[PDB]
Design a protein around this ligand. Structure first.
Ligand SMILES: [Mg+2]
Lengths: 43, 182
């Protein structure tokens, strides 16, 4: 269960955070949670 | 507020950003990448667990990422550790909701979410860090979780209802976000 719990979290965390951003008012859709993410290279 | 720039409402950040619009886009992007590096961890959960999530999310922008509120807003700062300890101790006494059926888990998670929300440990970013913790809480209990189950307007009203002690709107939120067993 532990290894499956970590596997489930890794599968869903990126989509869940995009949804969590939407709850805070950020203009983020479901497709944004599925997109590739850029690397950390803050401008 | 001391967390903000002098004569402004924008919080001081590591990138020296001074208007609120460009800081949200920087915060949204940089914290999203960080959210993709948070792994599920087993209980016991705690305030320090919550702080660890907040630090991972916002350490690229705020020095106080992971640190607790120093000013008031809610539970005042000097009582936040006591109040969070009460909540997490009660959650631990209930085996972190493991063994509970779906119907029971929904009512307990809804009440636990509002209780922790009243603590409000951080100057900013409380909701996002809290929901990642509740993601781990629900899948440790053994159930799927997706915040796409509700929209923003429903989420705001459920939290307002919870401020006034009415939890039924918070319960149907988790009724719609908690799914099948893993
Ligand atoms: Mg909230």
């Amino acid at each position: 269960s532990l290894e499956t719990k970590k596997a489930y979290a890794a599968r869903t965390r990126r989509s869940n955070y995009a949804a969590s951003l939407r709850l805070e008012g950020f203009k983020v859709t479901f497709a944004d949670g599925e997109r590739k993410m850029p690397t950390r290279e803050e401008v | 507020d001391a967390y903000c720039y002098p004569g402004s409402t924008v919080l001081r950040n590591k990138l020296d950003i001074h208007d609120e619009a460009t800081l949200s886009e920087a915060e949204q992007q940089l914290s999203a990448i960080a959210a993709d590096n948070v792994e599920f961890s087993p209980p016991p959960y705690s305030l320090a667990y919550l702080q660890n999530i907040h630090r991972i999310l916002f350490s690229d922008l705020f020095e106080w990422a992971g640190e607790l509120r120093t000013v008031g807003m809610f539970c005042q700062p000097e009582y936040m550790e006591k109040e969070a300890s009460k909540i997490f101790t009660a959650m631990a006494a209930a085996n972190w909701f493991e063994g509970m059926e779906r119907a029971e888990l929904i009512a307990a998670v809804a009440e636990a979410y509002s209780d922790i929300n009243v603590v409000h440990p951080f100057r900013e970013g409380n909701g996002r860090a809290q929901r990642i913790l509740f993601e781990h809480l629900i899948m440790n209990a053994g159930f799927e979780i997706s915040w796409w189950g509700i929209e923003k307007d429903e989420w705001i009203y459920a939290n307002i209802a919870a401020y006034n002690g009415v939890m039924e709107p918070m319960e149907q939120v988790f009724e719609k976000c908690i799914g099948q067993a893993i």
